[PDB]
Amino acid sequence: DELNLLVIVVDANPIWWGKQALKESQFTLSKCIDAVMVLGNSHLFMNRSNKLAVIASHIQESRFLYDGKYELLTSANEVIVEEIKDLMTKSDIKGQHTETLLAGSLAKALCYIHRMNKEVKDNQEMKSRILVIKAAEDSALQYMNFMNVIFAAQKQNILIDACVLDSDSGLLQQACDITGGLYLKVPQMPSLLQYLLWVFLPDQDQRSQLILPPPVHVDYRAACFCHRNLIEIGYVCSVCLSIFCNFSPICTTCETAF
């Protein structure tokens, strides 16, 4: 009767993976996809009632990615491979946009979790958690949407786990801190799957039983309204609580509201 839903958000930003491939490093996007598929198969093998969802983010949008081995796992892997191949082959750079649309993927994941919750029988509770792997740099332009997503996830009690590969993201740290999730930075990319099989694999009840690394130093720098950049000290309005980097005779937001 214990229903566990795992949603894996994969940062498939073409620029970062292209740079990694040009670096000729030991880790590639193919290995990351294989590790994600193995983690999903392990999660499904943990319990029959467990459900899996995979969403891949891109500059364009978010795509729902979902012979000796399990038949259902074979079909799931084939579907994931077909979806990722379709997304990558049809991915055409049309515009100057480069930041990953991480907020949209999280919103779609929350919508999918909400949809699945209603279909769940009343006698069972569907415990849901979201795992995010970060490859490219964080986007500061989507601060408000990211915070809204964090608050929505906290309202429904949905864990958010962050697995940073190269560049640490403050937004992911804040999400993990607020939602109670786990934030972890990968020291060695080729060993990534092992971490996925050691830290994020157990459920929240199982995490209490086991011993986990302490949370990293979470930052709480805000984003200025007129700059959309991280700041430490700024001017905050006393009415709409808007944050400004520099003093202004009149609040722009308050002037907007009539």
């Binding site: 029959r48 081995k69 399990y70 259902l72 074979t74 029988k121 009343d122 039983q209």
Partner: protein
Amino acid sequence: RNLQEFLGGLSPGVLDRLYGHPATCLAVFRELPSLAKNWVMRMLFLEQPLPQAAVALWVKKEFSKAQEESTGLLSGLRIWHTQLLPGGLQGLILNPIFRQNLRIALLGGGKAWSDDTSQLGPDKHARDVPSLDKYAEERWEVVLHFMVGSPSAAVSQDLAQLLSQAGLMKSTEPGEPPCITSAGFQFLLLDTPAQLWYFMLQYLQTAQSRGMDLVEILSFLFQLSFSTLGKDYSVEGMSDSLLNFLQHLREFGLVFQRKRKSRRYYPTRLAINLSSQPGFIVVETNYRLYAYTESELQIALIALFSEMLYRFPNMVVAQVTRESVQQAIASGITAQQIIHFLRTRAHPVMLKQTPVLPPTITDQIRLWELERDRLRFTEGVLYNQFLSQVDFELLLAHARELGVLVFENSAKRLMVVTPAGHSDVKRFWKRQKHSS
């Protein structure tokens, strides 16, 4: 009994042979506790043993009991074997055959479990999922009616003999049909997956009489457990005995097949549920049961422990009275089995409430169960002819040593013992006085 208990008593060679099939390894892994699964996954990609202390440090001190239980269960199942780490240390490493088969099942590799399905093309007489479910339900209803003794249901002779060997039904005289015992009623009250698992365990126990390979039967059953519903599989590639066993499955409704010589067989929903629906009984606080069923089997099962009131073409209204529960208990059915059956068959509407069944009804049923066992009777022999406390103490100690004592009371120097041990106690008492 469960799967773990059955696998505990098997020899290490049989367990190792079982691990040679990837399907068996997956079933064993899923039967493991939650903590054991994490340990198996962590040690899946390890080519070297780990120290026992290092494994013990993974779980916190407060939950050390669960860690010990998981380690003991894994050792009993022989999933991992202790390795003599150099320097006097002990290393823990999974079984190489089991680990390889688990990796093959999860990651991939090797040949498929089934030979092929497209060699013969599409089935000329293929059925659908609802048809297979209806066939399985009809087969199970026929089997259970034959257990009841209804002449409408007739099964094979060997199937009837299997029930007799299982103890559910006893044949007092040859030719006359057997009568269902209390164990048969308990089996009927059990859940359908539990009934299937118990029947399969009895078949495995009795397979030694037929001289059939236990490993092959278990591997085939586990392969059927994970088989996709609505997909046929190749009959070819199996030994002659196993096919015969498959024919018995054809009688059980687990596997559907058009003809004995046919090369296609469709696993059914019951076979899938063997590894592990919505319920059709509504329970009211006024001791009334509303069942959305039409088959005579469910009506009889409900009438075993309840009094029937109305039978609408798609509904059954019954009343749970004290007399009906007492009669059911006298028939041999305990209150816990009745509660479990009601919970299993409970309507999805009742699942909205925090308790599956109202506490008052369950408490009343349990209290009615204790009514029969309120009075305790013990046939025996009472000794009350002790002149001295010292003499009483020696005889009481001797009776306790013999283990035939029923009741003792040193305050009044009165004791009660079994009639079987009465002769021994009298002989001991005579020897003490004569030798004095």
